[PDB]
Design a protein around this ligand. Structure first.
Ligand SMILES: *[C@@H]1O[C@H](CO)[C@@H](O)[C@H](O)[C@H]1NC(C)=O
Ligand SMILES: *[C@@H]1O[C@H](CO)[C@@H](O)[C@H](O)[C@H]1NC(C)=O
Ligand SMILES: *[C@@H]1O[C@H](CO)[C@@H](O)[C@H](O)[C@H]1NC(C)=O
Ligand SMILES: *[C@@H]1O[C@H](CO)[C@@H](O)[C@H](O)[C@H]1NC(C)=O
Lengths: 162, 162
């Protein structure tokens, strides 16, 4: 199996993601998105693209990306500080269940995987999530995929921020 | 007029704030919240306080505060990185109108004002907002209140983030 052959799952309407806030990552590829919270935001009233935004928040640092739909269930992200483009797909989503929400998303470079983000608001207890992670690790460079919360900083009274 | 005598307006239910996302500050007191976007987040499924969170996002930096209600329409904030406490009130709110949402909030130390945050998603066009700012500037230390967006960094394709 190669990264281009992974499933490209249907994307839930944006409000379903917003209603899942806040999420934390359970499995990631590089160190970048360890100990990170995901927040979805609807488009600004003054946005001329009317693209929603994904926020990746790691302590007191934040990466924001406006995103729009592309072909074959892709998300086309524009990183808001640089204007750099990223193309993402979902292996699966399972939002707004009786046990909360999860999904696994990935970014390829051709046949290899270069980033991975499995998110949930149920502490990774959706059996689909572990299952998806085990499939993603089988594509080239998927050996890097690892648990995202092994050594996160101590909290100071909040639950999704530190 | 002193800061303790400013109005302490009714607080809209949290979902009305969430539905106003994203907001930007129009008037602030210190330099801290210049060029800053406000995002409200519902409590995490795993939060034992079930407090919502306010996010103040300034470029790639973020301050998060879980907050709960206190006496006399106060918001009691817990800054998520330090555990430091802040007590806030609203001069007014005007959320989810046909021209969007605005509010002005403040933080006193006794008779003086120490921080001010007027937010909107309509570029400060709610006449209540300019009016509230003109009242707040009359309390001790209100002379510091100023326009929040005079010199913000260039955007790179997004609208509420940079
Ligand atoms: C994929 O890798 C190649 C080789 O380094 C690079 O030129 C390209 O920009 C990368 N990203 C893609 C195709 O999104
Ligand atoms: C979340 O899952 C991790 C890993 O299994 C575990 O160590 C932790 O106790 C869980 N947290 C809760 C609140 O159940
Ligand atoms: C108000 O100012 C006094 C004097 O510096 C300080 O001790 C106190 O902690 C400040 N903050 C309050 C009352 O919230
Ligand atoms: C927002 O208001 C400022 C100050 O009046 C103005 O310079 C700017 O052009 C306004 N933006 C829009 C999109 O109307």
């Amino acid at each position: 199996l190669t990264c281009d052959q992974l499933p490209k799952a249907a994307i839930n309407p944006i409000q379903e993601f917003i209603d899942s806030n806040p999420l934390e990552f359970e499995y990631v590829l590089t160190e970048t998105f360890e100990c990170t919270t995901r927040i979805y935001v609807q488009p600004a009233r003054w946005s001329t693209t009317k693209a929603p935004t994904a926020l990746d928040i790691k302590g007191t640092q934040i990466m924001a990306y406006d995103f729009v739909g592309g072909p074959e269930n892709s998300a086309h992200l524009n990183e808001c500080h640089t204007g750099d483009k990223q193309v993402w797909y979902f292996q699966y989503t399972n939002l707004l269940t009786d046990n909360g929400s999860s999904y696994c998303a990935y970014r390829c470079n051709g046949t290899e995987i270069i980033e991975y983000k499995c998110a949930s608001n149920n502490n990774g207890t959706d059996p689909l999530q572990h299952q998806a992670m085990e499939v993603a690790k089988t594509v080239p460079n998927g050996d890097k995929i690892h648990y995202a919360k092994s050594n996160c900083p101590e909290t100071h009274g909040c639950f999704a921020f530190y």
